[PDB]
Amino acid sequence: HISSQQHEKAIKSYFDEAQTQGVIIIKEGKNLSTYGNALARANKEYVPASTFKMLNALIGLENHKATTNEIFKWDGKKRTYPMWEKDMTLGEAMALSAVPVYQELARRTGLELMQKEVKRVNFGNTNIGTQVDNFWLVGPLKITPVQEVNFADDLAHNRLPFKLETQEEVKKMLLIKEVNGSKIYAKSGWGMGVTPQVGWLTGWVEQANGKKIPFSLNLEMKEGMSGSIRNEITYKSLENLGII
Ligand SMILES: *[B]([O])([O])[C]([C][C])[N]S(=O)(=O)[C]C1=[C]C(C([O])=O)=[C][C]=[C]1
Fold first, then answer.
1. Other CB atoms within 10 Å distance of the CB of residue 40
2. Phi and psi for 51 in degrees, rounded to 5?
3. Do residues 26 and 33 touch, judged by C-beta distance below 8 A?
4. 3-class SS at 205?
5. What CATH topology corresponds to 4-240?
6. Where is the Penicillin-binding protein transpeptidase domain (predicted)?
7. How is residue 58 annotated by DSSP?
8. Cβ of 21: how many Cβ atoms within 10 Å?
9. For a substitution probing ligand 1, which of 52, 133, 141, 192 has the most ligand atoms within 8 Å of its CB?
10. Contact residues for 181 (Cβ-Cβ < 8 A; gap 6+)
11. Is 192 touching ligand 1 by the criterion CB < 6 Å?
12. How far apart are the first and last CA of the chain?
């Protein structure tokens, strides 16, 4: 019974109250819906930041640069965050957003193959530049929220150009929340190497009946915001729309 005006006002208020500017794009079948407090962000380009780990993992597994059980050993050097000072599989590194592990994977893939594969998937502006280990953090690779939700839609439905098994293995790494009978698969991003900083949460809800509803949240991370605001706004928005 809830009007579209009320859903739009509610979701906008979640971004307003977090003192940020952002959008969340929802896709139902082929139809995009855009909510939030800065709708024009929907077709603007931002660095993908750690959302690129979804594609990095697909590329590295497909090309035999790692297995899902391989343990990437911590090299013993101090990390930016202490939670990264440990040995990790790709899936554990996905959950911790452990940049160093995915930088190792990118170096195994190498610039030539990485560029070919990013072009082959047609991800964002497709440009990785000359540095195989940081192009998703500081540019030149960029992507819009519409492109991110369409990438999530492709992955959720096994439509990316990788083996089915590769896509299933990466999707298993993305389960972040179980709500009643729904499952939320997503990857966060926080681009601290750019100004303004960008925050992302891109993924999909798998409902109990099996329908998959992709989404992409994109906002501005401000001084002293918590990363959990990305999750909190996303979950509140999905709940307001009755998706979870
Ligand atoms: B990534 O998560 O976006 C990674 C590389 C840009 N972000 S970071 O290392 O600069 C800060 C960070 C963010 C997150 C997150 O949840 O996205 C997790 C750990 C560290």
1. 9
2. -60, -25
3. yes
4. strand
5. Beta-lactamase (3.40.710)
6. 27-238
7. H
8. 17
9. 192
10. 207, 208
11. yes
12. 17
